[PDB]
Design a protein around this ligand. Sequence first.
Ligand SMILES: CCCCCCCCC/C=C/C(=O)O
Ligand SMILES: CCCCCCCCC/C=C/C(=O)O
Ligand SMILES: [Fe+3]
Ligand SMILES: [Fe+3]
Lengths: 256, 256
Amino acid sequence: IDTFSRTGPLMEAASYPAWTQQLIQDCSESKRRVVEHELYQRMRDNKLSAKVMRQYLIGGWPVVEQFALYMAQNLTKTRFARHPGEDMARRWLMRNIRVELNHADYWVHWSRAHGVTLEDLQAQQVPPELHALSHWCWHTSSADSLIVAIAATNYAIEGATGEWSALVCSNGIYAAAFPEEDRKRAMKWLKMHAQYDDAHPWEALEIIVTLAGLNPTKALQAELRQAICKSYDYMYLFLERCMQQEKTAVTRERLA
Amino acid sequence: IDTFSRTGPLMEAASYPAWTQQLIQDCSESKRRVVEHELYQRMRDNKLSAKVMRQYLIGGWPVVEQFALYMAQNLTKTRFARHPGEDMARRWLMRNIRVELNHADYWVHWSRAHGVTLEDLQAQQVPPELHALSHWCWHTSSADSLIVAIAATNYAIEGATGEWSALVCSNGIYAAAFPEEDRKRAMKWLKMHAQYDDAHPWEALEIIVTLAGLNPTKALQAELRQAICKSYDYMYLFLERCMQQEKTAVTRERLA
Ligand SMILES: CCCCCCCCC/C=C/C(=O)O
Ligand SMILES: CCCCCCCCC/C=C/C(=O)O
Ligand SMILES: [Fe+3]
Ligand SMILES: [Fe+3]
């Protein structure tokens, strides 16, 4: 039968098969260097330059705007009662597309609090290192299997995003730096995503495990690992380029 | 500007531009012959043969199963803040994909109440006249513009479906023919769709009008009309083939 059914708590690695625990371990350093990135420690402390903050918001926009569209593309690959994991995916995607209803609007508001206009967002004037994530997300959503594309976007990206957004909000400095009358609206996107204990990525993982079963091939495991690490690695590429610009911007004003 | 904003009530033709009222008039006979079809008058009265009832349920299944998938494909065509109608479509599609969460399950239950198993549904052993609707729906959802595909599926098909399902439920005979212990579960799909005053098709129309504006080209109007009438016409083709089989089945037992 090879059929997976969770007994343990949703949000614990030990509730899943050994291969899934292995997958988490194999991707852990790729994840870590994103969720603990220096850029986020600086953002938390309100230290980032206007230039970099602007690039971050513009660069992140396409992935945020199109996030429910990746989910939609994945829904399009599912069929009713073809496999238990596939029914689980269908229902989950139908429920969670709705969750994103206002999230692009919140990003627009976050952006405007830093002087980034809707026009600025739409112009997409950022380095290519910043656009790579969006192209990967569409490629996997378009061309890959459901299980792989869900791993790349709902597990990897949303999981890491819960953690970086929690880090940004973790000491109150960033939020308190906004004028009181601007703060609620500016912070909304971050507040809605800020959680270490968010079920979303664990629900995605559960779906992936159900799709794959107890004994997936090594080849499928490799496909998942590579897709998940690709997502983290493109986030890392984005952040590294941002930090290069940060050093230049800060250094210029230090010397000026 | 050419921009449309509704002043009147949602569910009234007079609230929309003259071209939209014209479009409704041009499609009205195509619609009528579906929503008043003899098959539905017979279904209402519990008269349909086991054979035809079975074919109806099997034949309708793909469109029901894939209905949220058409919506998903249409969501994939939208972009944030590119046009006011397109924002309206995006938000509406994200909200209404969720609405369908349980609807395929309800159809399965309706089907089982007539001895049609999930296996039967999956086998799709029906005439080609019955499959044409599903192929059209996927073609338009896949290849056409958002405005056209939404007109074909959320306006035309869901609108007509509100009306035929209301007709089937209109005198209590069909429902009362089910044994009491089987009735709630058997009737659920029909009950959830049975409405003449459903907002869904009127919300779809409003989106279409907002997308098209006050002065769409004659060419776009023609594309909408032809897409809407195609949907009704494939429903009509389905129903005509069903009634041909009904006459044969009933006549055989009359003479036997
Ligand atoms: C390091 C690159 C930053 C990418 C920007 C975050 C993308 C987050 C996608 C999720 C959006 C949402 O749930 O509303
Ligand atoms: C005449 C052909 C019958 C087609 C079968 C109805 C298709 C209805 C599509 C809507 C399904 C839903 O809202 O859950
Ligand atoms: Fe979100
Ligand atoms: Fe429905």
